[PDB]
Swiss-Prot record, chains A, C:
Protein's UniProt name: Concanavalin-A, 2nd part
Amino-acid positions noted as binding a carbohydrate in the UniProt annotation, renumbered to this chain: D194, R214
Binding site for Ca(2+): D194
Protein species of origin: Canavalia ensiformis
Length: 223, 223, 223, 223
C-alpha cells in the first residue's frame, strides 16, 4: 500500500468533529476536539523536527479558539527518504466545498558540516488554471477564483507538489519541515460530513480504490 | 527547437562571461579571468520592473566580472520553464564541479499579500538526487557534489530542477528570480577549452544533437 | 543635514499626484504620474541592487494600473555605510489618515567569499501598542487596529526600524535591499494634500524643523 | 536581577551542554565532547505549540550532543527580549571565536496572513558592527569574526543583537524562534576551562558583577 502520514480535519460521524494525526492508518494515533466552522476560513499549521521527533498541528479560526494535536514519532522509521507532499479531501453526501486559499511548505536538511543546509520552499497564495507544478488527482482543479478546489463543485480530490521532497537523510543533524494552509469549508447543511488532510506519501502515491469518505482519499480501507 | 536564455562562462576559441538569448551568439559579453583549480561563484539576477538580466562572477582574492542585458523575458520565454546548469568540455582533461546551487522565484500580484514563490538550495548533492533531472554525462554523489561533465574528452552534461517554474504571469506587478552557484573548474592543461551555463528553458528541453563544445549543450548549431 | 534617499508618493499641488525618487533633495530626481485612490489600500514595492545600480519603485492598487519609477544611482556614493530605514508622512490641511497596514524589509551583503552572505529581514503585518523595535518620531503611533498611524488621527509622523542597517560594504560583490509596504490613505475631501515616503537615512536622523507638508518630514527646506 | 534563559556549553569543574532557566544550576544537561581547535555548530530551537526548548551541538566527523527541556517561555521571559552570545574563560590561554550567527523569530497570529518576523544572519563580522551591542572583552573584525573573550586569563565577553525581539504575544497561535552559531574554541592546554552560551534576556541585560567563569557572564552568583 502507499505509505501515509497525514494530519486530518474530519467531521465524519463514525464522534465529534476532530483534528487527528494518522501514521499509516485512518484509525488516528491521536485526535483533538475540533469546532468545524462552516463558511469561515480556517488555518492549519503543521510542524516537525528530527531533534524533538514530535509531529504537531494547530487549527484556528479568526477571533477563535484553536485546536491542537501532537504525536511523538520518528518519521525516519516511517516514511521513505523521498516523498511527495499534498492536500486531500473527501465529501460525504452533502453539498459542500473544500477550497484551499493558500498553501506553503518548507523543508530543511542540516548536515554535520559547516554551512551545509539543503532546502525547498514553495508558497502558493494564488492558484492558476494551468498550475504545472502541482499534480492533481481526483476531482481537484485550479483557477476557480485563483483557488484550488479539492472536491467536486461523494467526491475525492488531491493535489501533491511536483518535485519530490528529501525529508530525511541519515547524515543530517536536524531535518525539519513546516506546512501551512488556509481552507474554506462551505456547506448549506447544518452538520455536513467532510474531511481534508495534509499528507506525506511515497512519490508515486495515488488515490486508492474506494478511499472515499472517512478514508479521506488516503487509505483504501479502515476495514 | 528549445527556447534558451542562459548566462555562460566560456573559454573556447578570450575567456568571457556572456548572456545568450535564444542563440550562442551572445547578446553581450565581458572579459572573464578563468581561474583554474579555484572555486568561483556566479550570481544571476532578474526583475520585471527593471527588465534587465545581470550576472556577476567572482573568485576569492577577487576578480569579478559582470554583464547585464536589457530584455523583457515575458516576450522570450514561455510562461512555465525548467531551470538548470549545463557544461561542455573540449579536448582536455578537466572537471566542471558544481559545489552548490540555489534558486528563488517570486510572483507578486496586484492583490494584497499576493506572493507566489519557489526556492531551492543545494549545498550537498546525494547519489540519488530525485529532485534533479540529470541529462548527459552529469551525475551526483561524487564528494556530495554535482559533476556536470564526466570526471576521469568532449563531454556534455546538464542538470535541471524537477518542478516546473512559473516564471511570469500576465497579472503580476513584479516577477523576479535569482540564482547562485559555486563551481570548480580544474584542468591540468594551462589553457583548457570548457564552459558552464545556467540556463532557463521550456520544461521538456533536452540535449540537442551536436550541442558539444562551444554550443554548451544548449544549442544544436551556431546561428 | 541628514542624508536622505526616499521614494515618495505625493499629492501636494506644487502638479498631479505622483510617485518620485529623492536623492538628498525634495526636488525629485525622477517622478511618475500616480493615481492616488482615496480609501483604497495601496502597495509600494521598492528595490535596489549594486550590480544594476538602479533604484526602482512600483505602486499599485487592486484591479489596477500601477505606477513605476526607476533611477540610476550608486547608493555607495550617496549614503553612509550604516543607515536606518523608515516610513514618513505629512498631511496638508485636510482631514486624512496615513495608515500603514504592513511593512517588510530585507537587506543582503554577499561577499567575494564562498558562502558568505550577511542579511537582515523584518516583516510587520501587525503593529502593537508597545512596538519596541521601532523608533517613532512625530505624530506616529501604533496599536490602532494593530496598525501604524504615521500622521495624527498639518501633521508629520515617522517610524524607523531600531537596528541600524549595513547597506553597503566595500568588499561585497553584490549588496541589495527590497522593501514593501501597504498603505491606506483616507480623506473626506475630494482632493486632499498628503504624502508618504519610504526613506533611508543616517542612523540618527530626526524630523528637521519645518519639514511639514511638501517636505514630507524628510527635508528642512526646498527653499 | 536580569532574566536569563540560555543554552550553555561548558567544561568547568564533565564537559556538557546544558539548558539554564534563570539559574546556572542547569535544568537539564548532556555529556559534551569538547573538541579543541575544531569548529563546532550549535542549533537551538523552540516553538509555543510543543513548548519545548532543544539544542544540538555537533562537530564534523560527528559527535553530536543534544538536550531538550519542556518549558513555556511565556511564563519565564518578558515579552520583549534581546538575544545574544556569551563566553567566559578560566585560567587558561584560549579563544571563543564565533564564525557565524543567525536568528529567526516568528509570531503567527490567529488572523489570516498574520505573520510577524525578524531574521538576521552574520557570516562575517566587521570592525564596526553597529547592529551588535558588545559587552565585556568582546570585539569584532579579527579575521571578520567575533571574539567573545580577549585573544592574546579570566575574561568575560558578550554580544547581543541591537533590535529588541518580540518573542511572545498573548494573541499568537504559534510563536517560535531558532538560532544557529558556529564556534571555534582553541586552547593550547589539554583540558581547558571555558564556556559559551546563547542566551535570551531582558533588553537591558548587562554583565553582572562577578559573573566570571562557571557563571558564564550570565549569572552574578550560583543560586
Ligand atoms: Co478520524
Ligand atoms: Co560565447
Ligand atoms: Co514631488
Ligand atoms: Co553547568
Amino acid at each position: 500500500a502507499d505509505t501515509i502520514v497525514a494530519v486530518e480535519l474530519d467531521t465524519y460521524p463514525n464522534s465529534y468533529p476532530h483534528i487527528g494525526i494518522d501514521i499509516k492508518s485512518v484509525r488516528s494515533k491521536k485526535t483533538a476536539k475540533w469546532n468545524m466552522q462552516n463558511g469561515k476560513v480556517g488555518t492549519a499549521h503543521i510542524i516537525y523536527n528530527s531533534v524533538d521527533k514530535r509531529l504537531s498541528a494547530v487549527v484556528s479560526y479568526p477571533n477563535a479558539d484553536s485546536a491542537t494535536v501532537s504525536y511523538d514519532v520518528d518519521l525516519d522509521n516511517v516514511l521513505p527518504e523521498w516523498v511527495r507532499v499534498g492536500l486531500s479531501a473527501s465529501t460525504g453526501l452533502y453539498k459542500e466545498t473544500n477550497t484551499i486559499l493558500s498553501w506553503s511548505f518548507t523543508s530543511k536538511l542540516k548536515s554535520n558540516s559547516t554551512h551545509e543546509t539543503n532546502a525547498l520552499h514553495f508558497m502558493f497564495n494564488q492558484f492558476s488554471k494551468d498550475q504545472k507544478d502541482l499534480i492533481l488527482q481526483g476531482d481537484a482543479t485550479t483557477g476557480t477564483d485563483g483557488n484550488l478546489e479539492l472536491t467536486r463543485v461523494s467526491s475525492v480530490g488531491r493535489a501533491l507538489f511536483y518535485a519530490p521532497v528529501h525529508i530525511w537523510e541519515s547524515s543530517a543533524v536536524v531535518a525539519s519541515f513546516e506546512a501551512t494552509f488556509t481552507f474554506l469549508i462551505k456547506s448549506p447543511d447544518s452538520h455536513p460530513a467532510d474531511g481534508i488532510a495534509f499528507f506525506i506519501s511515497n512519490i508515486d502515491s495515488s488515490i486508492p480504490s474506494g478511499s472515499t469518505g472517512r478514508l479521506l482519499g488516503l487509505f483504501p480501507d479502515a476495514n
